Amino acid sequence: TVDLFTSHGVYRYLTNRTNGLKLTPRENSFESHSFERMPITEFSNNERRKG
Amino acid sequence: SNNVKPQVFNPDNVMMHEKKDGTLMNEFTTPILQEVMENSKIMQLGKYEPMEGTEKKFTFWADKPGAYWVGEGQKIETSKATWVNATMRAFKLGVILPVTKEFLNYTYSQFFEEMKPMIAEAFYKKFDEAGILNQGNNPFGKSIAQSIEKTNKVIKGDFTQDNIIDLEALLEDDELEANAFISKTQNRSLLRKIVDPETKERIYDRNSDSLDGLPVVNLKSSNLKRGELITGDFDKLIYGIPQLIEYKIDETAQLSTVKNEDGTPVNLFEQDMVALRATMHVALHIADDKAFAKLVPA
Amino acid sequence: EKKFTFWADKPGAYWVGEGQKIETSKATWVNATM
Amino acid sequence: SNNVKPQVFNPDNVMMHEKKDGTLMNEFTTPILQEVMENSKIMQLGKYEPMEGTRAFKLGVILPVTKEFLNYTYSQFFEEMKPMIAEAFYKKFDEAGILNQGNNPFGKSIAQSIEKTNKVIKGDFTQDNIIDLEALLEDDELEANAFISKTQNRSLLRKIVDPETKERIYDRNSDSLDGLPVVNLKSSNLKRGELITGDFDKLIYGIPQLIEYKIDETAQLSTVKNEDGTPVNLFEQDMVALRATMHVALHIADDKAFAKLVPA
């Protein structure tokens, strides 16, 4: 099950490895969000992102 | 010698910037591709299996203990479990593309970019035709067509709901259920014109490419004839990839499988040439020889 | 006038035994014009 | 290797630490340049042409060196040899373009231009013969730009004086004749009594690839046979080789722009 976050909403899809990860929209795939930028944030341990 | 005519090669596999008639190939318009690169159908249908070495071991239960009624105070009889082992090994796919450095500079710099996908396609197709159809000098002693041949699990006749149902029934006759169909795109014409006379519904979805509700996968190979159809419980087809496609480019090796006009092997350094090597390791295993059946025209 | 270059031949591939020589292969293209 | 006799190579182009007579060049003194290094004359005179892609032809050479020599005789060899190869390329290109010598690959050359137009003066060096040589160019509205000469004939040029102004027509300090610069060719093919002149802006050249050097420790030198006839393997025989290559192109825009003076 795959969630894709854009600057305007979340798209939901279904896939399997066997079919080659062909994304198929899930029932009621789209869901709007009220932010104006992609909601996920990444943090970094150092410039190289090494543990 | 100061011989300035271009080097003739045998076989003519070397890319060159100058033709033996004296034509010099500047201003080359990079070719475009009228096609989409084909996926591996085995990688699509079968089950991936992590494999670190060139060999893999599987072990499965085989026998299960019985059990007894015993009277009060009677001796309780014994029983026993049993197991069985299976194994799969990998093989190597490879190809080398030699290029003259003049060609690599003054005609088609991107050549060792554009080839890498066409190489991957060639590997996938080789793999599929070996594992599915047992064609192209199949290295494995294993294949779908070969399991079908040893079981003689073949139906003869025309594409009809009758025969298609019989084909699927041939699997549950061994307690297995069909999961997909393999067919030749030439034959969806035949599937498109068969209908149930009772419920009056068509067995093949022209829109979704589904046959009797199961997904159909099309082979590009020319070995699978129009009237032929294959089905099986593809979750019983196991594949592993110990080494994904590796590319190496070399400017100094010797190629022995290409000879100069005088018969000497091509030396990439002394002759100022470059060549691209692609290799891939792939392993195939049929977990149950009975899990596959085929329909063939009479 | 217009001119086109299209791929015509894909490079082959060979099953190679452990330590056997990898055979070579070549690409090819064809020209068309309108 | 354990061979106590040195390896004979055919052709004998491999550099070695030990001579055929058993002499190790140990402790070996650094070579020094007894002569000035020569620079390309058509690259000096002719007009450069920005060129993309190749007509061009490929110059190239391979210098094999025994790693014992690269260790125990003259370590810096490959750094000190690159200019000497550039010299060799300059000389090969100059000799091909000017004199039509050395199996030149082009169908174009100054010697062929002159031999086609028959624009040749038979005679010894005299002020009247120099003036006639120049007039052979100015006849066709082209003016001489420079002179090409065998340096060994400055002894002849110093003996000519303008009988009106009564001074040397040849400035031996400037090395300019009648006010025009004279370039010297070291090659053996241009004879003592031969002199060439032209409007060298009518000679065009291009260089798609500058001198590229690649040092290799692994290739096979098919062209160099061991004593037994097997090809030389660098890695296995513990050997190193330097490859140099260049692409040059030559064009003559007007073959009447060149004239030649030659002894009678």
Q: Which of D220, D156, D151 is nearest to D182 (CA)?
A: D151
Angle, helices D110-117 vs D77-99, to 10°: value is 10
Q: Which residues contact D258 (CB under 8 A, 6 or more apart)?
A: D110, D113, D114, D117, D119, D137, D196, D197, D198, D202
Q: Are strands B214-219 and B180-184 parallel, antiparallel or unpaired?
A: parallel
Terminal-to-terminal C-alpha distance of chain B: 67
Resolution, angstroms, 1 dp: 3.4
Terminal-to-terminal C-alpha distance of chain C: 6
Q: Does the beta-carbon distance from A20 to B44 stay under 8 Å?
A: yes
Q: Which helix (H) or strand (E) segment is D43 a member of?
A: helix D41-45
CA distance B291 to B277: 37
CA distance B197 to B191: 15
CA distance D3 to D18: 12
Q: Which of B293, B8, B36 is nearest to B147 (CA)?
A: B293
CA distance B225 to B213: 23
Touch test C–B: 3 Cβ pairs or more under 8 Å: yes
HEC secondary structure over chain B: CCCCCCCCEECCCCECCECCCCCECCCCCCCECCCCCCCCHHHHHCEECCCCCCEEEEEEEEECCCCCCCCCCCCCCCCCCEEEEEEEEEEEEEEEEEEEHHHHHHCCCCHHHHHHHHHHHHHHHHHHHHHCCCCCCCCCCCCHHHHHHHHCCEEECCCCHHHHHHHHHHHHCCCCCCCEEEEEHHHHHHHCCCECCCCCCECEECCCCEECCEEEEEECCCCCCCCCEEEECHHHEEEEEEEEEEEEEECCCEEEEEEECCCCEEECCCCCEEEEEEEEEEEEEECCCCCEEEEECC
CA distance D201 to D44: 11
CA of residue D156 relative to chain centroid, distance: 24
Local structure of residue D239 (DSSP, 8 states): E
| Most B CBs within 10 Å, among A18, A19, A21, to test the B interface | A18
* Technique that determined the structure: cryo-EM
Nearest to B267 among D57, D103, D219 (CB): D219
CA distance B281 to B294: 29
10 Å CB burial of residue A39 (0-12, 13-18, 19+) is exposed
CA distance B15 to D90: 30
Contact assessment for residue B274 and residue B99, using Cβ atoms and an 8 Å cutoff:
yes
Q: Does the beta-carbon distance from C6 to B98 stay under 8 Å?
A: no
10 Å CB burial of residue B24 (0-12, 13-18, 19+) is middle
Q: Are strands D231-233 and D220-226 parallel, antiparallel or unpaired?
A: antiparallel
CA torsion through residues D207, D211, D212, D214, sign: positive
Q: Which of B172, B183, B198 is nearest to B45 (CA)?
A: B183
Q: What's phi and psi for A6, nearest 5 deg?
A: -110, 180
| CA angle, D249 then D254 then D255, to 5° | 90
Q: Does the beta-carbon distance from B44 to A17 stay under 8 Å?
A: no
| CA angle, B190 then B193 then B194, to 5° | 95
CA distance D92 to D104: 9
| Most C CBs within 10 Å, among B95, B118, B255, to test the C interface | B95
Residue D102 touches chain B, beta carbons under 8 Å: yes
Q: Does the beta-carbon distance from D105 to B2 stay under 8 Å?
A: yes
Which chains would you list as touching A if contact means 3+ CB atom pairs under 8 Å? B
Q: Are strands D120-122 and D258-262 parallel, antiparallel or unpaired?
A: parallel
Question: Strand order in D47-48's β-sheet?
Answer: D47-48, D203-216, D239-252, D56-66
Question: Strand order in B265-267's β-sheet?
Answer: B9-10, B254-260, B265-267
CA distance B100 to B111: 11
CB-CB neighbours of A23 under 10 Å: 14
CA of residue D162 relative to chain centroid, distance: 34
CA distance A51 to B78: 56
Residue C12 touches chain B, beta carbons under 8 Å: yes
CA distance B148 to B130: 14
Our CA-based measurement puts residue D92 at a distance from the nearest CA of chain B, in whole angstroms, of 12
CA torsion through residues B97, B100, B104, B108, sign: negative
Nearest residue in B to A22, CA atom = B44
Contact assessment for residue D132 and residue D121, using Cβ atoms and an 8 Å cutoff:
yes
CB-CB neighbours of B87 under 10 Å: 10
CB-CB neighbours of D161 under 10 Å: 13
CA distance B125 to B121: 6
Touch test D–B: 3 Cβ pairs or more under 8 Å: yes
SS3 A3: strand
CA distance B144 to B228: 14
Q: Which residues contact D253 (CB under 8 A, 6 or more apart)?
A: D202, D203, D204
Q: Which residues contact B226 (CB under 8 A, 6 or more apart)?
A: B184, B186, B187, B190
Q: Which of D46, D41, D42, D50 is nearest to D199 (CA)?
A: D46
